[PDB]
A paper describes a structure:
Eukaryotic ribosome biogenesis is a complex, tightly regulated process that involves many ribosome biogenesis factors and spans different cellular compartments. Here, we answer these questions and reveal how the nascent 60S moves from chromatin to the late-assembly compartment in the nucleolus of Schizosaccharomyces pombe (S. pombe). In vitro, Fkbp39 binds DNA and nucleosomes but dissociates to bind nascent 60S particles and to partition them from chromatin through LLPS. This partitioning provides directionality for the nascent 60S to move into the nucleophosmin-rich GC, where its biogenesis continues.
To understand the molecular basis of the defects in 60S biogenesis caused by the absence of Fkbp39, we tagged endogenous Ytm1 and analyzed whole-cell lysates or isolated (Ytm1 pull-down) nascent 60S fractions from wild-type and fkbp39Δ cells. We analyzed the isolated Ytm1-containing nascent 60S by cryo-EM, which revealed 3 major states in both wild-type and fkbp39Δ cells—each state can be further classified into multiple substates. Among other differences, the RNA domain III is flexible in state 1 but stably incorporated in state 2. Notably, these 3 states look nearly identical in wild-type and mutant cells, but their distribution differed markedly. In wild-type cells, ~20% of particles are in state 1 and 50% in state 2, and in fkbp39Δ cells, the populations are ~65% and 15%, respectively. The accumulation of state 1 particles in fkbp39Δ cells indicates that Fkbp39 is required for a step in 60S biogenesis along the transition from state 1 to state 2.
Numbering used by the authors:
A (entry chain o): 102 to 238
B (entry chain t): 51 to 249
C (entry chain K): 5 to 29, 41 to 266
Write the structure that this text describes.
Amino acid sequence: KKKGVLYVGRLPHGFYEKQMRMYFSQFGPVLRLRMSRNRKTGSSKHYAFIEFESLDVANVVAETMHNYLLYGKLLQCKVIPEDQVHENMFKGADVPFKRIPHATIARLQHEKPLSKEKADKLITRHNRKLKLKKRKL
Amino acid sequence: FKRAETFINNYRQRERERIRLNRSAKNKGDIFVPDETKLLFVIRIAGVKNMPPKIRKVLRLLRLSRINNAVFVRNNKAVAQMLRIVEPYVMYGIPNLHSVRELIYKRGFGKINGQRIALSDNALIEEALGKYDVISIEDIIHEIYNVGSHFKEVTKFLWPFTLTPVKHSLMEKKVKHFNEGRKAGYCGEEINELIKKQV
Amino acid sequence: ELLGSDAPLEKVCSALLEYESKRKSNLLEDEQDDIEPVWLQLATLKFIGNNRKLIPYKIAIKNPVIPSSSEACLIVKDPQRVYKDLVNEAGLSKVVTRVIGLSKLKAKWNSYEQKRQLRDQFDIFLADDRVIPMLPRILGKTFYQKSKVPVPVKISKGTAEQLKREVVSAYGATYFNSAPCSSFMIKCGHVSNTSTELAENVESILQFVSKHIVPDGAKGIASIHLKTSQSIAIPLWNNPNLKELIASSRK
RNA sequence: ACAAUCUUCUCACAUGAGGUGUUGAACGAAAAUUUAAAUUUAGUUUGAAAUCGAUUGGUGAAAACGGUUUUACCACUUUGU
């Protein structure tokens, strides 16, 4: 009935979204699963949130997987009450992350086909850029 | 039921394979291509769940889509590149005359009408490969060993072998994850010993 | 002169030293001779790096940037008794404080806390040339992001005199870690260096950069600045031909 | 099945080129840059620590019927020889 949201922390490296759903769906159906990831690189933040169709199922999973010695880490499973569970907390759940290679895009942005007008829009007033430093002197 | 450690263990193995594949393919486009032999014997030793799709496809191209499958392949650059890609799962070496004869005489099955049919009589071989001057098992053996003109046709006709490890000893029957001690990679002449245990 | 047919050095660095000295403004007990380092900035017209090459560039310099009192941890391929004996034989104990085999480094320091403890125990981490590739693992971002990158000391043959030569060369050389970017910062020294010494360091670094970092050297160079951890990036020199170089390259 | 392939050196002629591999979070200075967000980046703190804060450009590989959903490092050599 009530959708129970479960926080899992201290996830061993490799216990990611596919592994969590495949494992936690055993206890019962899993509605939305999102494991936090860094903006720049998309690497795991080692904690996640899961939605279970019934709060009682989330209670059972919390009582069985909390302090689980897994790959040298104790797995922290605790149910978040709905009053601090936020509606946006599942934003981007079940959707694979896109590792944008900002270094690669910036590389192409550095070395891409360019025309005379864009070169003029690049040089601008570099003399003023030098002049600003000269005023700082 | 499955426990969380297996899911993590699978992931670490998958990323282990991903790192190996990138290293082997990128900046390591070199293969040693075992020489002084035009024939190779390859057997599928291991397999992993959620196998990388590139490995999954290369295995079926080599016709090693199931564990304990054994295939005769021609020693060339193309096979060696694919064999390097799927190295951790396959054991390969140089089969001698005794192994090739024994494998064909004892564990050779032909794809007749598209089913696995035992090569018990030369009548089927003559009917299936008569147009290539292949009439007997010995014709199959000669073609395979010498890599003749119709080596491509003979290999396609031949069904992959099933060299499942044999557990005769009481210790072999009891120990866990027994696979005869089958290592992975290139063994050279040792595959004849592995063949001798199976045939 | 290699820069743009001119060398606007000397005066620029003397001014930087005068600025650094002049902007001076409990008591503490664990004091060191640490001074603000000298940072040479260099902007190129293209990304000099395809990917972060976690192996530093042994830019040989005549005024060492590493203080001679710095303790060194030597990372060698196992066995470890062999190179411990060689260090003692060559009298590097005051310099090569600890020698660690590779497997022992992989086993005894597995925690990040253990990795951090080992990292802070030493000032420089020398590593055998044939075990550098292993070190991106076993050390992780605790070393390779927190300003402790192992140095590739070449001790393959392993005799007393080569060890001494490699170590003194290791201290005598500055290091830069190539990363994908157009602008990069290289250490030239510290304020304790005189104006002439830093200028000697600058020209030697630029000679190394033009050959082994920028494929087209000075033509690839866009602008150069001198700086410390806090000061203005004082422009040492700017390209006089970049107006046409950018047009030719970006077409 | 909490086991697995993160390299214990290469090639060329003492010399040159190569090795593609980094936990997350927090604090923080001032610099070059590129086309407001993005790349390098001093210096620090930390039990493999965690309670919303996800950024969103490009490449195609299979099912499916030219759309559609599925990849949980597919990155510009860009997802199945």
